[PDB]
Amino acid sequence: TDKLTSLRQYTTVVADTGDIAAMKLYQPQDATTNPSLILNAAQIPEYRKLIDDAVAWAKQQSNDRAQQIVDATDKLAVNIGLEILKLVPGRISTEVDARLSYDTEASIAKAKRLIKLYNDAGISNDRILIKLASTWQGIRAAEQLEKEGINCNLTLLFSFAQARACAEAGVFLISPFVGRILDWYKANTDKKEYAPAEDPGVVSVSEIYQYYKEHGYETVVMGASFRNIGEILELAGCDRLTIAPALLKELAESEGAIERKLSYTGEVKARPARITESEFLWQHNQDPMAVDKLAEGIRKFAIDQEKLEKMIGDLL
Amino acid sequence: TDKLTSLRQYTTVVADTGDIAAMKLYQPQDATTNPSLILNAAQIPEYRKLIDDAVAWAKQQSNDRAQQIVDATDKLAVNIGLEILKLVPGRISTEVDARLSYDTEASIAKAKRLIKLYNDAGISNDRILIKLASTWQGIRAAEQLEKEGINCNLTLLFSFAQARACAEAGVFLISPFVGRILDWYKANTDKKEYAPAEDPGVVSVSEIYQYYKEHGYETVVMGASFRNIGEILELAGCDRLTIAPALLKELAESEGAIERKLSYTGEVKARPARITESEFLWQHNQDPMAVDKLAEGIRKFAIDQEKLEKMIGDLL
Numbered sequence: 170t171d172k173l174t175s176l177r178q179y180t181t182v183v184a185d186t187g188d189i190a191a192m193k194l195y196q197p198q199d200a201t202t203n204p205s206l207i208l209n210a211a212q213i214p215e216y217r218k219l220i221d222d223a224v225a226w227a228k229q230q231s232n233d234r235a236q237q238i239v240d241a242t243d244k245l246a247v248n249i250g251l252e253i254l255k256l257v258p259g260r261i262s263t264e265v266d267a268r269l270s271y272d273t274e275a276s277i278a279k280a281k282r283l284i285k286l287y288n289d290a291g292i293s294n295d296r297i298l299i300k301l302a303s304t305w306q307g308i309r310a311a312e313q314l315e316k317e318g319i320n321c322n323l324t325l326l327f328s329f330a331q332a333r334a335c336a337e338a339g340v341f342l343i344s345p346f347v348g349r350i351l352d353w354y355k356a357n358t359d360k361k362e363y364a365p366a367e368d369p370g371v372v373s374v375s376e377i378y379q380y381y382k383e384h385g386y387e388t389v390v391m392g393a394s395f396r397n398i399g400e401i402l403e404l405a406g407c408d409r410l411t412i413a414p415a416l417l418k419e420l421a422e423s424e425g426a427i428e429r430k431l432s433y434t435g436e437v438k439a440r441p442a443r444i445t446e447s448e449f450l451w452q453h454n455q456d457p458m459a460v461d462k463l464a465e466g467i468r469k470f471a472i473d474q475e476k477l478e479k480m481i482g483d484l485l
Numbered sequence: 486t487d488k489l490t491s492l493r494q495y496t497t498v499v500a501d502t503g504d505i506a507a508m509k510l511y512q513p514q515d516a517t518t519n520p521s522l523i524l525n526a527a528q529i530p531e532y533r534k535l536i537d538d539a540v541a542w543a544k545q546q547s548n549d550r551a552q553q554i555v556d557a558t559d560k561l562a563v564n565i566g567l568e569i570l571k572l573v574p575g576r577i578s579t580e581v582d583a584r585l586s587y588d589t590e591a592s593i594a595k596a597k598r599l600i601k602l603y604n605d606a607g608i609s610n611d612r613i614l615i616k617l618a619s620t621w622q623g624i625r626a627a628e629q630l631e632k633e634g635i636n637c638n639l640t641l642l643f644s645f646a647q648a649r650a651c652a653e654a655g656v657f658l659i660s661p662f663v664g665r666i667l668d669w670y671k672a673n674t675d676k677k678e679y680a681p682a683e684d685p686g687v688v689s690v691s692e693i694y695q696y697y698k699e700h701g702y703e704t705v706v707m708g709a710s711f712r713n714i715g716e717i718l719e720l721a722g723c724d725r726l727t728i729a730p731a732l733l734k735e736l737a738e739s740e741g742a743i744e745r746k747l748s749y750t751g752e753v754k755a756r757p758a759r760i761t762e763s764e765f766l767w768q769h770n771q772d773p774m775a776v777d778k779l780a781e782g783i784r785k786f787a788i789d790q791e792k793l794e795k796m797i798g799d800l801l
Binding site: 422423424 | 632633
């Protein structure tokens with residue numbers, strides 16, 4: 170068979186895009202979006218109806234332009250999620266405003282608002298994953314949300330400290346980026362070419378995977394952000410993997426069966442004491458890569474949120 | 486019997502021309518064209534209908550003159566291929582614009598366009614071979630095309646590095662030139678007269694043939710470009726051989742049976758590691774003949790593409 174079909178034996182395939190065409194082509198279990206993908210999705214001509222629906226609904230909720238821009242941008246994200254849910258049997262990941270990444274209370278509020286919008290469309294909490302950046306504040310937000318029945322996808326995870334803190338908060342899922350870790354090592358280091366096994370992102374996810382299974386953590390590990398299929402194949406065995414359409418296409422067109430790389434065959438060991446904020450900040454900041462990338466990811470997603478608000482504002 | 490009939494026992498005979506008269510005379514399994522042959526074919530008075538069909542079809546697809554010239558030149562190549570397919574049971578080779586030889590993405594696009602035109606005429610992919618120059622970029626284009634169901638004919642092959650890279654990409658067929666290799670040695674060397682066995686082109690193809698069969702490569706080896714029948718006879722046994730009408734005539738008029746020269750009777754050996762771009766460029770450039778000829782072939786085919794576009798432009 171082809172690589173994609175072979176991968177499904179060990180790993181749950183998730184599509185990373187806001188485009189419904191890829192859902193029809195690759196039949197993933199779940200789908201994920203982020204502010205950059207939602208902004209890109211808004212440029213697709215077929216999605217014009219969704220934008221008009223967002224704007225029309227916003228104007229019916231209030232006569233205040235400020236609230237209208239926020240209501241329409243949230244609704245558009247939810248609308249794109251609604252279309253995807255019609256084609257996937259699993260969950261959809263929708264991300265909260267990145268500008269709230271360092272605000273626990275604002276993140277809880279925004280997450281509940283997106284959930285309310287989905288609930289308004291008849292969709293229940295078991296089909297949604299609220300996406301939050303893995304800062305200490307987002308993690309503390311997620312821990313509280315999980316207790317309230319809202320499942321979260323802790324994204325932009327780069328350091329081991331983030332992985333440990335997320336697991337201890339009892340979050341549903343974490344999204345360790347693989348490709349962005351490679352980007353950093355390509356830019357800030359001597360070595361520009363890495364073999365799949367020596368790829369920093371792969372090594373990072375593998376280490377996180379083993380740590381989670383070793384201590385019996387129920388938190389799902391979903392590798393995200395890929396630059397090539399080599400990284401995907403080397404992670405065959407990971408709980409789930411969110412892959413972009415271009416690489417999903419490469420897997421489907423490449424023949425040959427693949428072997429499982431990620432496994433933990435031993436017994437569950439005792440969990441250590443919970444990491445504190447001070448220890449988290451110390452450990453996270455020891456990692457130069459994670460320092461740059463966590464901050465940078467939040468910035469880019471914020472710019473894309475503003476760019477969406479700009480677009481929506483011109484239509485009111 | 487005659488040499489041509491005797492040759493068919495060991496080698497699949499392919500006609501190298503765009504002229505349908507030769508298909509009727511020699512009954513080849515396949516046929517091949519290239520930009521120089523397509524330009525020559527366009528001068529044949531019987532082919533005027535095909536040109537008028539190309540121009541008329543182009544004008545119906547768009548009102549933009551730039552697109553019309555491109556649509557008509559592609560259609561003419563496809564039209565000549567359509568006439569040939571009515572007389573041959575096998576495949577037809579149609580070559581992509583040589584000006585795209587160092588552009589992988591443009592080559593994939595152009596190949597898919599020619600395939601689309603053939604499909605528009607009801608012809609399926611199994612009857613077509615898309616011809617691409619054997620540069621690293623064309624090889625990478627071909628590897629991707631094969632995965633998508635488009636079979637390719639890697640032409641203008643001169644060096645062993647090209648042969649190795651083509652085999653590893655899993656391409657359907659390769660066309661090592663024999664006569665152009667001889668031309669180079671006649672121009673850039675002391676020896677002007679070569680016996681069939683010491684002919685550089687023959688020795689080149691023989692070496693490539695053995696390498697392919699020795700490692701179990703499914704890639705078909707088709708010798709092309711001949712200067713005399715001695716080269717053809719010395720290659721009796723090669724998978725296929727694309728011969729020009731003049732030499733095809735010489736074989737049919739010469740009596741006597743011939744013996745098979747090219748064979749591999751041993752077992753299939755293990756394939757080495759895949760050659761990288763750096764190693765390819767190094768090995769290819771070590772061969773002075775291949776350096777000159779690959780570059781020169783692409784230039785000549787480019788000039789002929791422009792000459793065709795000139796002709797077509799004067800008819801719009």
